[PDB]
Ligand binder design. Sequence first.
Ligand SMILES: Nc1ncnc2c1ncn2[C@@H]1O[C@H](COP(=O)(O)OP(=O)(O)O)[C@@H](O)[C@H]1O
Lengths: 751, 223
Amino acid sequence: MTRWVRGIFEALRPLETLPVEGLIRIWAHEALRLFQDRLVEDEERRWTDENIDTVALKHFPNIDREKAMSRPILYSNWLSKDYIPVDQEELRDYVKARLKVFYEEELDVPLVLFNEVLDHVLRIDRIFRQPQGHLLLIGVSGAGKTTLSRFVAWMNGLSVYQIKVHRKYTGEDFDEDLRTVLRRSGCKNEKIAFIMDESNVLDSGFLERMNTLLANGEVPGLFEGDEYATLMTQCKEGAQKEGLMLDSHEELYKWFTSQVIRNLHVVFTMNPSSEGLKDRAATSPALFNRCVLNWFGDWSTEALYQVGKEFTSKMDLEKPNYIVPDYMPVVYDKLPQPPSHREAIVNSCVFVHQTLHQANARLAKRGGRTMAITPRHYLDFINHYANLFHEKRSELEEQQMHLNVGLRKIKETVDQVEELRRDAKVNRSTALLKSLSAERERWEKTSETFKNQMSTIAGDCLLSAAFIAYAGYFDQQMRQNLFTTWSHHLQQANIQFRTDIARTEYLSNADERLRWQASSLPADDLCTENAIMLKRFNRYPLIIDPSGQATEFIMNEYKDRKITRTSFLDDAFRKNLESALRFGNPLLVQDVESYDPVLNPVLNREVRRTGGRVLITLGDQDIDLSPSFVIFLSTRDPTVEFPPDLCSRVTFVNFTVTRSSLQSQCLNEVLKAERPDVDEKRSDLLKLQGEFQLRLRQLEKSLLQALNEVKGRILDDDTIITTLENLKREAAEVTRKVEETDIVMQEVETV
Amino acid sequence: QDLKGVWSELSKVWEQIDQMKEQPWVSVQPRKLRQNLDALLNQLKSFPARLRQYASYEFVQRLLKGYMKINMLVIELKSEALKDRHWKQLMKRLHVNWVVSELTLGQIWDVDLQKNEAIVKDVLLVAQGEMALEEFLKQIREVWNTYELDLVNYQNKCRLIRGWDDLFNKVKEHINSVSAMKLSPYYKVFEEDALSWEDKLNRIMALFDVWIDVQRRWVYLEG
Ligand SMILES: Nc1ncnc2c1ncn2[C@@H]1O[C@H](COP(=O)(O)OP(=O)(O)O)[C@@H](O)[C@H]1O
């Protein structure tokens, strides 16, 4: 109530004339910033939103409610001054401009400014623009806590300063770091936005000192001995700078303390956890007394859809022949009707995110082990989508260009042979012309198939990326269920994709699979999918496996790149990280349960690129990051729990055998050991997804290489046609496989 | 006429700018420079709109605005970071031949700092790393040259040493920091002194690790 009063007073101070509607508007905004801000779920937020208007109308009749309480309640001083109310759209334009400027100086990584972010920025600014404005942010990892904190700190002149924690982090290092931050804040009179995660909060020793610093405004016992004398030496200089000459030690000490209150804001970025929140309430009341707290958890559907739209701008997603389906499966209510191709794809992506939340909730209800799902998973998924779309479109484009060059060469060769005919040999030439024409129509059919693949590429890439980035912790059955759910949702969207897409082959080639089989890796579908994920990832993978096949597998895969083994328990881990960054060799890490917070900059990919240099901040030292560096995290106990901050930085690769993985393994073993013919037919069905076409492409490349030398010598018997009839026979074989795929598929299903 | 008047005002402004630019870079105070240039901008705005519409006035106004924009570049340049080697790198990359003693604000202003913002920022960050490591080394020398052993009496027989934990912790943190400093591209400067201090730290660590055992055994056997 007193904060309500003070906020109303501060908002009313610069104004001279103000109608009653403006007063009740300020009243409502301040109540929202005090009461609705701390709420957790949506029901309480709606309850507050409706009852504030109810109270306002019940105590203030005969006033217009539209201007008095407008739905986009929002206050700031950025535009003009005097804390005047600002419209949402003009504020959005201003924050876009400031974000673009920020992109110029710091954090070039794109951010999307939706309504939630627009509100949180103003809340953070309002708390910062206040003496002793310590603040606590609560939200799931990747929701934009630290990012928005640093953005607002930069915008306000606050020099962001965050401590970094690692293992064996003694209290003396922490005390030195507080000494440094207080010296920078008070003695030198620069405002500091002091920021941290939950990782360095877990130790209870630091919480006492922070409790004193937050409540009193200054921690006794941190400054003593010669350090206190030095502190006094620059405290006198600071007093001289402000023209506040003082000589007694205690008055200067109070002046330094007051400088600390006026020029130090502490920000706590922390993961929602009811039991942990209760524990930290028990051990530190100042986190709830002095530190006003902000809630923002999972991104709303509108935030996800806006992120999807913004991050799929370079991607083509423009099908002029896209037929809008009746009864569109929609999860975003404000979807344009009729939606375009890009709108439908982004809606499907939001559906994938929401349905995986649903699957996680269902699995938790079943009593199984679940891992927290964060918006960083959505960002990683959209990155996989962009990368896969670009890569597949490129591969198809060079394949089509190769086909066109081959067709032009074939036409030139046909013209040359016609000119030669113009001059038994004639029969051979006529047969050559017939075969060349036949293979020409065959390549026209190949162009038709290429166009069909170009049609299906969008759905194929979406399913592939959704599997790689999202799934991986779940067993084989849950992965298959999620893939089917996505497939049915997209077929309800009339989006084009292969109905019998194979995830293992569409995401790799024959050579990589044989290379994996050369290393220690069983021929299991789960193992193949996990190796697929290990091949392609944006966030460094975390490996869970009870038998240890993955560790030796990724050793054998990266032996040529001098991969090294080191665990968290070993004290040489930090030195091995230094060596890996300096040289660039891969480094597998075991025993991930006893996580070391030193890897957070590595996992977060906090790279500083300036002046032809790339830097990574481990400890208080900057290290040149080698371009070819990669790290793998591994463990051995499946029944372990991970902090969601870790879960939001690594992609899970699960090797644990379940009631569905072993069932499939035994079924495949029986098929290969009892009904071999069915095994080769199933292999032919599975490898029809490009591998036969890949062999045809390679052999056609060899044929073009041979045919390039066409002058007389190619007519040794006027028939070099052996290579082209060979091509014709494998082409007929693969075509016969294509026509007869359904019958063989049904037979394999029956067996 | 109006053209003659605006030409005279432009000549006065150019003379003022040239007189300010004659100040050597060593004696150019960024705060006073910003205040005086703001005064010049206020003087320029005092001209009538008819004199403001002239192209030359617009050119001088936009030049002063660019000086405003690069004033923070000037502030970062005028510090304890550039020294003389970073200035040498800047001259080498910008292909300009200046004199350090005769360096003035005019010569730097002639080179487009706004166009070369990336180069200047890279030099500033390199200098920041170099000055950070230099101050770390200065702290090393100031803490090891003034450090004294904690001597304490032993029943009027001798004067022994206490405080082993603090000294050993300082040595370990120091040796770890020095070893880690071998990383980073900034390590290429002052390498020889770094290795010399490495040798000094190893020597003191080994000597005192032997000394603690010697002292403990001597106290026990004397008892
Ligand atoms: N509004 C947004 N639009 C797009 N990307 C965002 C947005 N907010 C955050 N991000 C991305 O998500 C990440 C947020 O991480 P952060 O919230 O700082 O983690 P933590 O809360 O654990 O410190 C950033 O890397 C940023 O790129």
